[PDB]
From a paper:
Alphavirus CP possesses cis-autoproteolytic activity for its cleavage from the rest of the structural polyprotein during the viral infection process. Here, we report the high-resolution crystal structures of the post-cleavage state of the AVCP and dioxane-bound AVCP at 1.81 Å and 1.98 Å resolution respectively.
Similarly, the structure of AVCP complexed with dioxane was refined to 1.98 Å resolution with Rcryst value of 17.9% and Rfree value of 26.7%. The electron density for the dioxane molecule is clearly visible in the difference Fourier map in the hydrophobic pocket of AVCP. Dioxane binds to the hydrophobic pocket in the AVCP-dioxane complex in almost the same orientation as that of the SCP-dioxane structure with similar hydrophobic interactions. However, in AVCP, seven residues (Met135, Glu136, Lys138, Ile140, Tyr183, Trp250 and Gly254) are in hydrophobic contact with the bound dioxane molecule. Further interaction analysis of cdE2 and capsid reveals that dioxane occupies the same position as would be occupied by the pyrrolidine ring of Pro405 of cdE2. Thus, competitive inhibition could be a plausible mechanism by which dioxane and its derivatives may disrupt capsid-E2 interaction in alphaviruses including Aura virus by obstructing the hydrophobic interaction of conserved Pro405 with CP. The conservation of alphavirus capsid hydrophobic pocket and binding of dioxane to the same hydrophobic pocket in the crystal structure of CP from two alphaviruses (SCP and AVCP) signifies that a broad-spectrum inhibitor that targets CP-E2 interactions during virus budding can be developed.
Numbering used by the authors: 116 to 267
The structure:
């Protein structure tokens, strides 16, 4: 696979790292050790601004990793827990469909490319708006945070 559990000392899942475009990327707030022998002890570079940390993907894994795409037209997208809507510049899910432990999971299109990484969500009632990292065409990271975001 290309998505890895990040585990605390008791071995409980805290969040997820992904393999993407020659990097291991996980949310910075996710406390733990990636649960992969090749990934556990790499040198990570940490960016507070984007709540992101990343390491170089070990050479073994370069044909494995997800592709990223900047093409997110309005519509529906996929994640581990089901449909993610993208509309008016925001990703949303039914409230209750995501929660703590979900930080780091990718949002995917039907071809299996990453459009966004999940940081948290703000409860707006029926729907929860997702705080995420995306990248633009020049490779610049963008963090979108909504009011009263709960880190997952």
């Amino acid at each position: 696979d290309r998505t890895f559990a990040v585990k605390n000392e008791d071995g409980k899942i805290m969040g997820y790292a992904v393999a993407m475009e020659g990097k291991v990327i996980k949310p910075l707030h996710v406390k733990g050790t990636i649960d992969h022998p090749a990934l556990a002890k790499l040198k990570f570079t940490k960016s507070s601004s984007y709540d992101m940390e990343f390491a170089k993907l070990p050479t073994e894994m370069k044909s494995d990793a997800f592709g990223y795409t900047t093409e997110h037209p309005e519509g529906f997208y996929n994640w581990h827990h089901g449909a993610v809507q993208f509309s008016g510049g925001r990703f949303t899910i039914p409230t209750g469909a995501g929660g703590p432990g979900d930080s780091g999971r990718p949002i995917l299109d039907d071809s299996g490319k990453v459009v966004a990484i999940v940081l948290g969500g703000a409860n707006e009632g029926a729907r929860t708006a997702l705080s995420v990292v995306t990248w633009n065409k020049k490779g610049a990271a963008i963090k979108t945070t909504h009011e009263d975001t709960v880190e997952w």
